[PDB]
Amino acid sequence: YGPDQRAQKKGDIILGGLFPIHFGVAAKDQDLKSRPESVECIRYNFRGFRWLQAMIFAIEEINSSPALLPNLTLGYRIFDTCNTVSKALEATLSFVAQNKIHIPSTIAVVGATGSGVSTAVANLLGLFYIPQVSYASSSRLLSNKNQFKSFLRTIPNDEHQATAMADIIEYFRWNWVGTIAADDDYGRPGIEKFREEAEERDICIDFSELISQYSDEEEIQHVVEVIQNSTAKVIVVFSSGPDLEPLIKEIVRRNITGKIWLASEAWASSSLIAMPQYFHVVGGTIGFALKAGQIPGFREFLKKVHPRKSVHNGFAKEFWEETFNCHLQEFRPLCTGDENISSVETPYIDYTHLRISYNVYLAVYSIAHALQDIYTCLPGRGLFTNGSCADIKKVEAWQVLKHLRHLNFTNNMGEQVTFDECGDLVGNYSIINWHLSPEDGSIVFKEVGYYNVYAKKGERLFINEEKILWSGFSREVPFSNCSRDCLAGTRKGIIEGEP
Amino acid sequence: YGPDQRAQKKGDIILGGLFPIHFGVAAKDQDLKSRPESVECIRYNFRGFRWLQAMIFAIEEINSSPALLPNLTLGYRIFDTCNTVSKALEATLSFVAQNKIHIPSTIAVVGATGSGVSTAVANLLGLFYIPQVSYASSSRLLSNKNQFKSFLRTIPNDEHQATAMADIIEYFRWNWVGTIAADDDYGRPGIEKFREEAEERDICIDFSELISQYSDEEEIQHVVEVIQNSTAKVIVVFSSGPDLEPLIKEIVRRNITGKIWLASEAWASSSLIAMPQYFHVVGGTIGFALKAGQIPGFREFLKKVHPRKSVHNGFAKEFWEETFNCHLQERPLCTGDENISSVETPYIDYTHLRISYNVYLAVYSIAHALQDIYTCLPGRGLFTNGSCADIKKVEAWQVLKHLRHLNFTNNMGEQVTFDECGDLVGNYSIINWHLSPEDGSIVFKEVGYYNVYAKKGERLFINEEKILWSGFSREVPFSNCSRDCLAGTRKGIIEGEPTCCFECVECPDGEY
Numbered sequence A: 001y002g003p004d005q006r007a008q009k010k011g012d013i014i015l016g017g018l019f020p021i022h023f024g025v026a027a028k029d030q031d032l033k034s035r036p037e038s039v040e041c042i043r044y045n046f047r048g049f050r051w052l053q054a055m056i057f058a059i060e061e062i063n064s065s066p067a068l069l070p071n072l073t074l075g076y077r078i079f080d081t082c083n084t085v086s087k088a089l090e091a092t093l094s095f096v097a098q099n100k101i102h103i104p105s106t107i108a109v110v111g112a113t114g115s116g117v118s119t120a121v122a123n124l125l126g127l128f129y130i131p132q133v134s135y136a137s138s139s140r141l142l143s144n145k146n147q148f149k150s151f152l153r154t155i156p157n158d159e160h161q162a163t164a165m166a167d168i169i170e171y172f173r174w175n176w177v178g179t180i181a182a183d184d185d186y187g188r189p190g191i192e193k194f195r196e197e198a199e200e201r202d203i204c205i206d207f208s209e210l211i212s213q214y215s216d217e218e219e220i221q222h223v224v225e226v227i228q229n230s231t232a233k234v235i236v237v238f239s240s241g242p243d244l245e246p247l248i249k250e251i252v253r254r255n256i257t258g259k260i261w262l263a264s265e266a267w268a269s270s271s272l273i274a275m276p277q278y279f280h281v282v283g284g285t286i287g288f289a290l291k292a293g294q295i296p297g298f299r300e301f302l303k304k305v306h307p308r309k310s311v312h313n314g315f316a317k318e319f320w321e322e323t324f325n326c327h328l329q330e331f332r333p334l335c336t337g338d339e340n341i342s343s344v345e346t347p348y349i350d351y352t353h354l355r356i357s358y359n360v361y362l363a364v365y366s367i368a369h370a371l372q373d374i375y376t377c378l379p380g381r382g383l384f385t386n387g388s389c390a391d392i393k394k395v396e397a398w399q400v401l402k403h404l405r406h407l408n409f410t411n412n413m414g415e416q417v418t419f420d421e422c423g424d425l426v427g428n429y430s431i432i433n434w435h436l437s438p439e440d441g442s443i444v445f446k447e448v449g450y451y452n453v454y455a456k457k458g459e460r461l462f463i464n465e466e467k468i469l470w471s472g473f474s475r476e477v478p479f480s481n482c483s484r485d486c487l488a489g490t491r492k493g494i495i496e497g498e499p
Numbered sequence B: 001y002g003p004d005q006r007a008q009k010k011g012d013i014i015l016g017g018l019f020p021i022h023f024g025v026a027a028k029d030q031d032l033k034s035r036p037e038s039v040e041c042i043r044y045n046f047r048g049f050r051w052l053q054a055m056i057f058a059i060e061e062i063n064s065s066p067a068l069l070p071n072l073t074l075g076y077r078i079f080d081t082c083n084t085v086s087k088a089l090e091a092t093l094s095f096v097a098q099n100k101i102h103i104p105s106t107i108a109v110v111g112a113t114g115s116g117v118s119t120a121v122a123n124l125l126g127l128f129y130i131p132q133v134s135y136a137s138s139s140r141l142l143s144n145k146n147q148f149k150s151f152l153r154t155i156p157n158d159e160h161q162a163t164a165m166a167d168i169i170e171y172f173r174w175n176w177v178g179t180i181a182a183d184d185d186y187g188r189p190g191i192e193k194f195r196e197e198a199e200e201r202d203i204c205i206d207f208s209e210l211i212s213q214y215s216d217e218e219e220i221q222h223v224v225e226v227i228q229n230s231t232a233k234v235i236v237v238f239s240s241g242p243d244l245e246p247l248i249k250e251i252v253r254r255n256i257t258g259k260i261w262l263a264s265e266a267w268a269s270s271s272l273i274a275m276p277q278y279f280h281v282v283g284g285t286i287g288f289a290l291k292a293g294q295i296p297g298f299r300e301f302l303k304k305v306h307p308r309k310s311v312h313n314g315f316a317k318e319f320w321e322e323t324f325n326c327h328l329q330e331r332p333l334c335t336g337d338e339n340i341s342s343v344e345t346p347y348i349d350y351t352h353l354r355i356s357y358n359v360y361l362a363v364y365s366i367a368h369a370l371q372d373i374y375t376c377l378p379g380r381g382l383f384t385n386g387s388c389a390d391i392k393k394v395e396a397w398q399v400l401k402h403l404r405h406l407n408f409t410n411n412m413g414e415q416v417t418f419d420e421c422g423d424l425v426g427n428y429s430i431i432n433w434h435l436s437p438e439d440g441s442i443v444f445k446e447v448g449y450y451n452v453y454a455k456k457g458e459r460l461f462i463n464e465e466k467i468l469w470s471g472f473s474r475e476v477p478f479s480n481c482s483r484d485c486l487a488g489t490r491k492g493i494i495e496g497e498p499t500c501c502f503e504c505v506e507c508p509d510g511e512y
């Protein structure tokens, strides 16, 4: 059961996992004139492979520490989703293969990345009460506990992002904008929340459009026609890189400049949009980012992968091949095997901060500490029936979920990690700016403030306007009002139809 | 296996089924202090039982006719979903149980009602390329063929409904309304489309709220207060009966009267809201409806039910118990000789068949897809090299391919064919809620239609002479946020308020 390439290790306790190794699937048509065959995957995601190694590192750090879960070993079974629902469902059917009835059971799943994939996986995982701990899903629809009974996450939701964007617009005195969002369960609720917030602060919106990764030519042309027919220089986008690339390509080949973008977290640091060829269009973007944690011995673990020594990993071979443009054997030169991964610039060991990787780390330690709480329990002071402890020899999924619901522990950085009613965390935000490197010629992200989620309303945002390059060259705030303000000797008037 | 309650029969080809026999599940939630049990369904839906009987009737009619499918017999396997995702997922896992690994396979499935349930079912059914035909799901999110490969339906989507509501509001000139929607995949896209159209037509919307079947007291109280403060008389609702009942209960308890409700097809005929004691609030509602059909011999088959002769129907015993307030023993004891006509229930208390006619069409659609595979000639086929499939060993994707190229004639002399998004087209009927003078009861009276086959601006037709506003009044209400400027005067601006609301200032001296 399950797909062919996988990261698998045996042990007393087995943990699941879903990571987007590939960016997407093939644009194919199957008019069913023959028996259908399995779809393929196209592009290679080096960021996703880095997230995969964080879970392995956390598990192997737990197994080597006698203070956490002694006399017990943890395994894993990690698959690939290709950013599609169907592959995730194929893997999940293997996750719950024994509960529906030679395959070990699953007690915890480190959830997917996309919101739609997470929803589709959770709808099936909630039947058997198997906890799922996501690390990048920030939709507000997953906070509903009537439908998703066993969903937890280590990332905050998207209400504060919309509120902060409205706060920025109010801060810089703009009242004429336009909105774009992806066509999924992550973009639509967020853009709706932003519209709800902006209606109260008297901000008028000109156009609203929806995009998708599989949009045809005559839906991109219409969207880019609507954009250039407007007089608003401020555009708000709730989408990811794969869902935004075609529109950006079309805009670039048309050479449309002068717009100001307010990026969400999904594409704030995406490598598909932050390209020097696009700088004369996407330059000067303002976006949001999370707070970066610390993992001490992580670079050494990343810099010791090998297609032959990493027998437990099935993605290492393709990582080597895609990195070195080389072909392994059991145009493309043959692989010697002694090549060095430090000589190639890829989003694998070329990073400045760890944000989602820290989330994977935290999810694995949350599961481990729930298991530890099960382990070190005194009978008569438990959490089940008349007060009892669950046996660590025969632990089940729902007991782990119950312990996760009542979790409180201090991480390696010296701060508590507690899950709220709907299994969410609250955290700070960091506001960044897109610059141009003077020496290397790449794109540099620079912090220009922060968003405080603890302070009172109206005292949260903090902007250092002195360090904002408005288009990479400008040092003056853009004008984005619909009409010029009247003077002392005049008054206002009404234009029929217009807001 | 799956759930214990079911209705199945042996045959060469088996069809699936998903009907909402109940309205919902129990309100109990576990604290995870013990092993969780199976959730239980609470209310009984007499409308959902009628739709199942339509599928059974269609199959039994096909088996008797030699012209349609000789030498082949159709069975069935029908489950209950209770308007819940988990039950439907369990039933669907039972449907595809053979293909995960003795178990017969399911050629086709007649889909669910709710869009949220249908999406969850289709996500799992699309892996195995099993065709699914829905009779009530009408969300536009299900028209994306890049995700739902094998979804088909016999009901139009809601874009035309939203445009029709905008046209109705434009016909009776109002520019100050409100909107209420359900928090699922059905009410959100429709309300977004309506907001787009209303902004296009220069109509101002005051508020916008979201409700759900499991909303607590504070949310309902906040929603009602929002409606109370605003002066917008006209309210537009995109939801169903179960999701709207708590709000209507709270409003009726607080006695808020005078609003004009525009109703979607989901609750324009629901028996949970169309009640005589709600009339002083929901009276005079204007809503949409589908087009009725004819199924001769249906009522007799409906009236020949019994909890003993129905060997193949496991839902009949609870039907009898609920109908006669009895208890069958293997609450008085059941004699078993009572008359169905004695008890007045939504089972046979109907006037037109509108959703139960879609089940008929779905069953004949699958039947005609199998007649095409059955009868063909070598070199004349939809598959590779012009070859034909094997009727003796037929697969699901062949049925899907033949469904994508289907063109047949209904019983009542009209054509059916499906678009390449698996959707259909049809007209609408606009009804008005009255009060019957003989028996106090809501009565729906048709006042106009919406010809979807016409050009823009010539589709809506409304007869005003048969509309009773608020159920008694004969005068068109008023909703504009501002009294009209009379003459010799100028518009004004009020700060912080929409352009729909002005001040009516007088002109300067020497002008006109």
Ligand SMILES: *[C@@H]1O[C@H](CO)[C@@H](O[C@@H]2O[C@H](CO)[C@@H](O)[C@H](O)[C@H]2NC(C)=O)[C@H](O)[C@H]1NC(C)=O
Binding pocket: A428, A450, A451, A452, A453
């Ligand atoms: C979230 O951000 C706020 C401000 O950005 C943090 O508050 C700061 O806390 C440090 C140390 O406690 C103080 O030295 C600063 O003066 C605080 N800033 C302000 C504006 O009061 C807060 O600690 C952050 N939260 C977390 C969990 O790190």
Ligand SMILES: *[C@@H]1O[C@H](CO)[C@@H](O[C@@H]2O[C@H](CO)[C@@H](O)[C@H](O)[C@H]2NC(C)=O)[C@H](O)[C@H]1NC(C)=O
Binding pocket: A173, A174, A175, A202, A479, A481, A484, A485
């Ligand atoms: C663009 O419009 C905004 C609001 O429409 C203007 O913000 C006003 O700024 C003045 C002076 O700073 C304040 O007295 C007003 O209260 C602000 N408006 C509101 C609604 O608070 C802004 O000045 C305009 N910018 C330009 C360049 O005209």
Ligand SMILES: *[C@@H]1O[C@H](CO)[C@@H](O[C@@H]2O[C@H](CO)[C@@H](O)[C@H](O)[C@H]2NC(C)=O)[C@H](O)[C@H]1NC(C)=O
Binding pocket: B173, B174, B175, B478, B479, B480, B484
């Ligand atoms: C309520 O407002 C609507 C539009 O804001 C009014 O409709 C206008 O009516 C005048 C004549 O009274 C026509 O000349 C306009 O063409 C109408 N506008 C549109 C867009 O159709 C309506 O009359 C107002 N109601 C009342 C009672 O005055």
Ligand SMILES: N[C@@H](Cc1c[nH]c2ccccc12)C(=O)O
Binding pocket: A113, A114, A115, A116, A136, A137, A138, A139, A186, A240, A241, A265, A266, A267
């Ligand atoms: N929050 C996104 C997922 C996401 C977060 N960060 C990302 C970075 C890259 C790609 C996707 C993401 C969603 O729900 O859809």
Ligand SMILES: N[C@@H](Cc1c[nH]c2ccccc12)C(=O)O
Binding pocket: B113, B114, B115, B136, B137, B138, B139, B186, B240, B241, B265, B266, B267, B355
């Ligand atoms: N169109 C509805 C389905 C529906 C039609 N009539 C109904 C009556 C009751 C409940 C649901 C329905 C939906 O998308 O969900």
Ligand SMILES: *[C@@H]1O[C@H](CO)[C@@H](O)[C@H](O)[C@H]1NC(C)=O
Binding pocket: A255, A257, A280
């Ligand atoms: C595109 O627009 C920029 C900005 O004005 C201009 O400098 C450039 O010449 C244009 N054409 C290109 C980049 O081919």
Ligand SMILES: *[C@@H]1O[C@H](CO)[C@@H](O)[C@H](O)[C@H]1NC(C)=O
Binding pocket: A408, A409, A416, A418
């Ligand atoms: C978690 O435990 C620490 C231990 O002192 C305590 O200070 C903190 O308040 C606890 N967190 C919650 C949410 O109770």
Ligand SMILES: *[C@@H]1O[C@H](CO)[C@@H](O)[C@H](O)[C@H]1NC(C)=O
Binding pocket: B407, B408, B415, B417
């Ligand atoms: C369907 O069949 C009818 C009658 O054979 C024919 O007139 C029509 O062109 C066919 N196709 C469509 C799309 O209706």
Ligand SMILES: *[C@@H]1O[C@H](CO)[C@@H](O)[C@H](O)[C@H]1NC(C)=O
Binding pocket: B291, B425, B426, B427, B451, B452, B453
């Ligand atoms: C809709 O109504 C028009 C006119 O009333 C009619 O010509 C057309 O055939 C109808 N279509 C359907 C699908 O009923």
Ligand SMILES: [Ca+2]
Binding pocket: A062, A063, A064, A065, A066, A067, A068, A069, A070, A071, A072
């Ligand atoms: Ca250990």
Ligand SMILES: [Ca+2]
Binding pocket: A497, A498, A499, B199
């Ligand atoms: Ca306008």
Ligand SMILES: [Ca+2]
Binding pocket: A199, A200, A202, B496, B497
């Ligand atoms: Ca206002």
